[PDB]
Design a protein around this ligand. Structure first.
Ligand code: CDL
Ligand code: SF4
Ligand code: SF4
Ligand code: SF4
Ligand code: SF4
Ligand code: FES
Ligand code: K
Ligand code: ZN
Lengths: 211, 263, 115, 95, 115, 176, 53, 209, 96, 129
């Protein structure tokens, strides 16, 4: 119900249209090759989503439809944003009605802290909890980048493990940095009062870029 | 020559005969688990944590005192070896008191660290744990003997390195204690090293007790000036001050032990 | 066959009313530049395999829709654009000649983890 | 919600929608702030038998990155079968 | 052994050539930056401050490192003229606030027990 | 699966163009905005009357710290030093030396509020639930020095927010 | 963001989350999606000059 | 999954990217020193410094790779090796839903020709590496400082720049501006020497020296 | 139990006492020193000593999971009545 | 093998002026390359397998307010570990720190004999068990 008014007085408002359509228009190949992620791909007509193409976690069981549009301007991405909230509502529904029973943490004391009740009765629980909060679990060497479909876009972390209980280096890949990397073209062909709308649709937040 | 070759987990080593498995696995760089064995000290073969599996062996063999010869392919990551380590360790851990937050060995405890590399994640224990009284053999050594694992390292250290024959294991069964029976005042000038050989917090330095934890003490390698040997020592530093002194290794100098007033 | 594609579904990527013929002429074009590179190169050993392969599918079946499934490349405009950069990729490694062995072996401990 | 019927009928006209059915301010239908104690389920490996760590040591059952070649008819192999079209939204295809 | 790849230099000659018009650009840079950024320090003060910074990077004898100092050197002048930097940035090299670290043995000995 | 958003193919019939022309000529989508906003006006607000009433919280709420004590008044802290071993901002500093009755309990427990993150790792790290995240949050001060807590400040808050914290930890130990 | 870091460390550790915990994460993962898009559309509208949304 | 604790492993993905690793190896064996698949099913390509443009262009337009989504570019700086800066790219292909990692090596002085021709996404994934690490990429449109203070010296994310840095800011009355000074800490960042003295994983054991 | 310093600064359980010449005591002037009057040192001096009888006592700390990790305390040293290290509660045997 | 306007410099590699370290932190420092000494309490030696480089301890003064560990030595947090020592010398010289060396002390082989504990005339006959 609360979404409707957000749609009613913005989607139909000709004022919102002329202030959000035909701005920040990004062609498909430029979006893909500028490193853009998430909605810019979805907005510009490109059929791609991490949550569906490589469904992580348990997104397998859930079913829904991502809103790829036609033009890809800031207006089109706005419908993609609004429709994603509607889509997210159903995804909430599907996990809600069939939440499985079971434990909240992996039954691996070497990686998950033992339960408080188990902590004060089991000698192993004390040892495992003790060292887990001093140095933590030792992660075997290797490196991964695995990313998820964050609502900002393709958000991934690239950590390298030294074979100890501490990371060596975790590059903070962020959709916003890729998002903003094409800002030069993005504001091209438009004036200040509407490229600020381009800033809004880009979903830039200065904690993913600047870290 | 007499040098005899052994299939150490595959790879072959021409080890010198009479060398035990522990004195062979380190050749390639494999550190066998241990609690009762000490390289600088004698061998007892009691804690049963070095226990490893020999190929085609009916039972896992105590790698602590296994004189090795030709063939005899050892297995590091075998299921039977893991079975032995898993069982034995929770046998140590069975009656061990839940003292890690109050024990100074916390963060520098073998029994703590060995239990996170080759050890279970929970216990099937639902009975009680044996408890033994403390002892008072010095204003430097502090005895929480319920934490003792009866590895007898202190006894062999006392009667072979310090030359004092007063430590021992009184009793039998399971309630026996590694104590001194008659009340005693540990007099040896190498008494401070008794702290650094016990793998648990059963024997601990009284002055340093409840003063610092291992993960915050920056270690600096330095020397001793108390004696004219220049003992290679480790100086623990934290917040512009020193807490406790550890012995380094150089063989000709202090080796692995330091005298008391040095510590 | 089929009526003209109203929109390819990808902005910037326009429509082409001559799907099969444009694919073919571009395809012989990449066949042309494949000649200059030696046959023994694994490049030429692999591209001509897929050259003669999917040049047959475009030639045999002329319909837009059946060609889409047979090549799993979305709309034809995507495929010919995809084949277009294949041509440019062919030109670049024409002058590159990356067929000789490694330029030089890596340093002794340059790789291998942990340090 | 409080509001008499004249207020409710007025906004239902201006909105054109039934605001009374679902309001945006929570009422007594929410769960009681105090709730009964929980009894969360036991661990999936809580069995005290046949549960040795040698059979489920996840961190220890990782191998180093497998090498296939080093400096020191061949079918065209693709890293994955090329992805296809998905579907057109049986529930609601076009807004 | 000594085989290294260039970026801008082969011989110290051209390496010293790059720092030449780098000085030239910086030499003509002082008159505008002081006036436009509204400082108090004098024009010749800036010119010698540019000058001395050259002398700090003078003991290196590798064409390979100087250009890295050149690109770092050329990474600052545009940041000044295009009002990218600020007063706290360009007066920072005019090291002013900090007390003068003692240089003789006694004065260092008196201040503290550090080298 | 996916669905389109922008495409509409507005029909060019005489009736349909009339609605579009009417919408432009006599504004209708804009008056819709007025109708929605006016309907919003005739609705009671959601504002809360602070401090006369403050918004809801949870038994797990993480706020100002407090060092708790046993039923008889003993400090639960034992300087096991786990809390700063996991304190992500290193806001906890602890020292311990002998206590009079043979004990060697702590002397220093300073959690710098201006360094602390309120993640709650400390209370989970504590094996004797000594340090906890209290429910209080109204401890704003006008001096940076006030937020720098010490052992006595922590213990006083433990005696101040005691009954509330004890009930919360009694209502939450099953979850933990 | 917790989701990305978690599965990343899960991937290196070769440990998979329990099935129950997997379903809670997507519940809050989509709540963040609700969180983000609500901020995204309105701040855009705030930048334009729309206040009520 | 009979072992819910462990992460289930897949083999159909394992061998396929293993085969594709050979595929790329044969196509241009001039630059690929070695290819390493992962237990995480993330195959990685190890290339030569001059090989940045060829392989990156190759995965971009090839009909069997189509890797055209630049995920990230970063450095994994390793002091113990002569090429401390380890430049690594991550590529994504929408058509075949796979992720390719290409890894290089570089000293502080050796350059790398810019990949802006391959991906214009690198434009800013190039600037910060030059700032954060100090390695300079040749023929790039701009090498500006993007993630540091104006006039900042050194390169922070190196394993040489300390956590606290060298310079600290403060607003001073005499100058009426926020001026700099050598760093001074109320608290020294304490050390947590937490690496256990017991071996963790026999599988990844370093070969004896 | 708290004892007052000559300058009036109530000393804490750790024993801290800013002297007359300590210039930093000015932080306390025009303000108040914060002291927890409840001195945990002496709250066990008066605590009753349990006459529970067995060779080993399971001291859990009361409140079940709300206390401290339960420890086994041995009662064989008749000179020293056993005290839980976590608790400080005093336990003695019924004269063995 | 390779040449692109090849540069040939014999000067020992030195960044120093480009790495941005200050002068007093490049002239008045001391770096002792060594193998971490294992804590004698822990029998395991999974720390004597690397080469750690750090600098000299500097002044540490208690903060007047509350008793912190206030210091002004930025160059004390570096615990750089090396696979070997020949790279450690390389790292020391490329920055030009005051190089120092410590030799990677080797465990003297301690050939044991459980049967020696039960001798017949040797003092190795153990009186402890
Ligand atoms: C302009 C329209 C006419 C005047 C206002 C009418 C009005 O408020 O009607 C009540 C009511 C208020 O809205 P709500 O959310 O429906 O109210 C429900 C509860 O009964 C509301 O429950 P409640 O607990 O709020 O009821 C108590 C309330 C009751 O308040 C009233 O009855 C309002 C009139 C007070 C006089 O009084 C107070 O809260 C005391 C404070 C009063 C604040 C100042 C009021 C100033 C009025 C004008 C003064 C002269 C200028 O509105 C209507 O009944 C329909 C619209 C008004 C129709 C009027 C006739 C045409
Ligand atoms: S000896 Fe080790 S396991 Fe026992 S209480 Fe002390 S730290 Fe814990
Ligand atoms: S007191 Fe310590 S050294 Fe002696 S047997 Fe017990 S655990 Fe071993
Ligand atoms: S608060 Fe808890 S974890 Fe922290 S030192 Fe005290 S007892 Fe240990
Ligand atoms: S809540 Fe604060 S004090 Fe506790 S661990 Fe987190 S940051 Fe440290
Ligand atoms: S190691 Fe051989 S028994 Fe202790
Ligand atoms: K000990
Ligand atoms: Zn107790």
């Amino acid at each position: 119900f609360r979404i409707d008014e957000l749609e009613e007085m913005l989607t139909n408002n000709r004022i919102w249209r002329n202030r959000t359509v035909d701005i920040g228009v990004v062609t498909a190949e430029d979006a893909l090759n500028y490193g853009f992620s998430g909605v810019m791909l979805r907005g510009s007509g490109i059929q791609w989503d991490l949550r569906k193409t490589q469904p992580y976690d348990v997104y397998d069981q859930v079913e829904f439809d991502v809103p790829i549009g036609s033009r890809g301007d800031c207006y089109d991405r706005y419908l993609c944003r609004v429709e994603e909230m509607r889509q997210s509502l159903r995804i909430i529904s599907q996990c809600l009605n069939k939440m499985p029973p079971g434990e909240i943490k992996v039954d691996d004391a070497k990686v998950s802290p033992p339960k408080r009740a188990e902590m004060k009765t089991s000698m192993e629980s004390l040892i495992h909890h003790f060292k887990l909060y001093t140095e933590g679990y030792q992660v075997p060497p290797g490196a991964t980048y695995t990313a998820i479909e964050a609502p900002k876009g393709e958000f991934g972390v690239y950590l390298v493990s030294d074979g100890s209980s501490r990371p060596y280096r975790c590059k903070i890949k962020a959709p916003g940095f890729a998002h903003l990397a094409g800002l030069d073209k993005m504001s091209k062909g438009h004036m200040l009062a509407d490229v600020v709308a381009i800033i809004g649709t880009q979903d830039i937040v200065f904690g993913e870029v600047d870290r | 020559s007499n040098l005899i070759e052994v299939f150490v987990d595959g790879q072959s080593v021409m080890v010198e005969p009479g060398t035990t498995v522990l004195q062979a696995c380190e050749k390639v760089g494999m550190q066998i688990p241990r609690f009762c064995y000490h390289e600088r000290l004698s061998v007892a073969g009691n804690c049963r944590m070095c226990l490893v599996e020999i190929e085609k062996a009916p039972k896992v063999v105590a790698a602590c005192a296994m004189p090795v010869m030709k063939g005899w392919n050892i297995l590091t990551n075998s299921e039977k070896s893991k079975k032995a380590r898993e069982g034995v360790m929770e046998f140590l851990l069975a009656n061990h008191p839940l003292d890690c937050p109050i024990c100074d060995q916390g963060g520098e405890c073998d029994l703590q660290d060995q239990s996170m590399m080759f050890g279970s994640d929970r216990s099937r224990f639902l009975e009680g744990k044996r408890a033994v009284e403390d002892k008072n053999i010095g204003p430097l050594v502090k005895t929480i003997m319920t934490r003792c694992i009866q590895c007898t390292r202190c006894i062999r250290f006392a009667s072979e390195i310090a030359g004092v024959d007063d430590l021992g294991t009184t009793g039998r069964g399971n309630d026996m204690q590694v104590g001194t029976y008659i009340e005693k005042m540990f007099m040896s000038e190498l008494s401070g090293n008794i702290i650094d050989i016990c793998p648990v917090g059963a024997l601990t330095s009284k002055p340093y007790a409840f003063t610092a934890r291992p993960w915050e003490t920056r270690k600096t390698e330095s020397i001793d000036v108390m004696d004219a040997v220049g003992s290679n020592i480790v100086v623990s530093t934290r917040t512009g001050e020193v807490m406790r002194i550890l012995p380094r290794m150089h063989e000709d100098i202090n080796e692995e032990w330091i005298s008391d007033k040095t510590r | 066959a089929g009526l003209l594609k109203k929109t390819t579904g990808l902005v910037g990527l326009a429509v082409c009313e001559t799907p099969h013929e444009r694919l073919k002429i571009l395809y012989t074009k990449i066949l042309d530049v494949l000649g200059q590179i030696p046959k023994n190169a694994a490049y030429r050993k692999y591209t001509e395999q897929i050259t003669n392969e999917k040049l047959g599918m475009v030639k045999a079946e002329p319909d837009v829709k059946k060609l889409e499934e047979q090549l799993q490349g979305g709309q034809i405009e995507e495929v010919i654009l995809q084949a277009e950069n294949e041509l440019s990729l062919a030109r670049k490694m024409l002058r590159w000649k990356p067929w000789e062995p490694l330029v030089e072996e890596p340093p002794a401990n340059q790789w291998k983890w942990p340090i | 919600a409080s509001a008499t019927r004249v207020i409710q009928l007025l906004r239902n006209w201006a909105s054109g929608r039934d605001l009374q059915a679902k309001l945006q301010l929570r009422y007594q239908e929410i769960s009681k702030r105090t709730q009964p104690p929980p009894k969360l389920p036991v661990g999936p490996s809580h069995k005290l038998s046949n549960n040795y760590y040698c059979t489920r040591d996840g961190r220890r059952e990782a191998m180093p990155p497998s090498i296939v070649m080093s400096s020191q008819e061949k079918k065209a192999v693709t890293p994955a079968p090329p992805i296809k079209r998905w579907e057109l939204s049986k529930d609601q295809p076009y807004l | 052994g000594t085989s290294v790849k260039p970026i801008f230099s082969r011989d110290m000659n051209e390496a010293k050539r790059r720092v030449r018009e780098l000085y030239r650009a910086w030499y003509r840079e002082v008159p505008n930056t002081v006036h436009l950024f509204q400082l108090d320090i004098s024009v010749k003060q800036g010119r010698d401050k540019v000058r001395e910074m050259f002398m700090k990077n003078a003991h290196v004898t590798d064409p390979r490192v100087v250009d890295l100092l050149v690109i770092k050197g050329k990474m600052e002048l545009e940041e000044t003229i295009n009002v990218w930097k600020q007063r706290t940035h360009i007066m920072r090299f005019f090291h002013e606030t900090e007390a003068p670290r003692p240089t003789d043995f006694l004065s260092k000995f008196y201040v503290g027990h550090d080298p | 699966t996916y669905k389109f958003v922008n495409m509409r193919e507005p029909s060019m019939d005489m009736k349909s163009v009339t609605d579009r022309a009417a919408q432009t000529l006599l504004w209708t989508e804009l008056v819709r905005g007025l109708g929605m906003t006016l309907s919003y006006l005739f609705r009671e607000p959601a504002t809360i009357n602070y401090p006369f009433e403050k918004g809801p919280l949870s038994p797990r709420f993480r706020g100002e710290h407090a060092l708790r004590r046993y039923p008889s008044g003993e400090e639960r802290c034992i300087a096991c030093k786990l809390c700063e071993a996991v304190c992500p901002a290193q806001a906890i500093t602890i020292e311990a030396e002998p206590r009079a009755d043979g004990s060697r309990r702590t002397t220093r427990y300073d959690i710098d509020m201006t360094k602390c993150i309120y993640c709650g790792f400390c209370q989970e790290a504590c094996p004797v639930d000594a340090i906890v995240e209290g429910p209080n949050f109204e401890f704003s001060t006008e001096t940076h020095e006030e937020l720098l807590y010490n052992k006595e400040k922590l213990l006083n808050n433990g005696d101040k927010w005691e009954a509330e914290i004890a009930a919360n930890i009694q209502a939450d130990y099953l979850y933990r | 963001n917790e989701q990305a870091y978690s599965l990343a460390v899960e991937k290196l550790l070769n440990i998979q989350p329990p099935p129950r915990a997997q379903w809670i994460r997507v519940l809050f993962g989509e709540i963040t999606r609700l969180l983000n898009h609500i901020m995204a559309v309105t701040t855009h509208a705030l930048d334009i000059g729309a206040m009520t949304p | 999954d009979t072992r819910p604790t462990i992460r289930p492993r897949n083999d159909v993905v394992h061998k396929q990217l293993s085969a594709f690793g050979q595929y790329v190896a044969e196509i241009l064996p001039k630059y690929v020193q070695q290819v390493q698949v992962s237990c995480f099913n993330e195959l990685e390509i190890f290339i030569h410094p001059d090989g940045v443009i060829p392989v990156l262009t190759f995965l971009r337009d090839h009909t069997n790779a189509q890797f055209k989504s630049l995920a990230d570019l970063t450095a994994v700086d390793v002091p113990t090796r002569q090429n401390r800066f380890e430049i690594v790219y991550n590529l994504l292909s929408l058509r075949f839903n796979s992720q390719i990692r290409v890894k290089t090596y570089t000293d502080e002085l050796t350059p790398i020709e810019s990949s802006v021709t391959v991906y214009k996404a690198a434009n800013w994934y190039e600037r910060e590496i030059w700032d954060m690490f100090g390695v300079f990429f040749a023929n790039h449109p701009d090498l500006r400082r993007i993630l540091t203070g104006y006039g900042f010296e050194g390169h922070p994310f190196r394993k040489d720049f300390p956590l606290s840095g060298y310079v600290e800011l403060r607003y001073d009355d005499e100058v009426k501006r926020v001026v700099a000074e050598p760093v001074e800490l109320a608290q020294e960042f304490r050390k947590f020497d937490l690496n256990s003295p017991w071996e963790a994983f026999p599988a990844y054991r370093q070969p004896p020296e | 139990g708290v004892r007052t310093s000559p300058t009036g600064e109530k000393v804490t359980h750790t024993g801290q006492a800013y002297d007359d010449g300590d210039y930093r005591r000015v932080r306390f002037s025009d303000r108040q020193k914060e002291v927890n009057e409840n001195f945990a040192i002496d709250l066990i001096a008066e605590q009753p000593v349990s006459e529970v009888g067995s060779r080993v006592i399971s001291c859990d700390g009361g409140g079940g999971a709300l206390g401290h990790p339960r420890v086994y305390i041995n009662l064989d040293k008749e000179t020293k009545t056993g005290t839980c290290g976590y608790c400080g509660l005093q336990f003695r045997q019924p004269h063995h | 093998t390779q040449d692109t306007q090849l540069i040939a410099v014999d000067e020992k590699l030195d960044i120093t002026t480009l790495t941005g370290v200050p002068e007093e932190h490049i002239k008045t420092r001391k770096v002792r390359i060594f193998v971490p000494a294992r804590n004698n309490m822990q029998s395991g030696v999974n720390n004597t397998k690397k080469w750690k480089m750090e600098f000299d301890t500097r002044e540490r003064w208690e903060n007047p307010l509350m008793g912190w560990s206030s210091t002004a030595d930025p160059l004390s947090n570096l615990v750089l570990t090396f696979s070997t020592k020949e790279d450690a010398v390389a790292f020391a010289e490329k920055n030009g720190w005051s190089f120092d060396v410590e030799e990677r002390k080797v465990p003297k082989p301690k050939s044991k004999s459980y049967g020696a504990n039960f001798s017949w005339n040797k003092r190795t006959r153990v009186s402890t068990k």
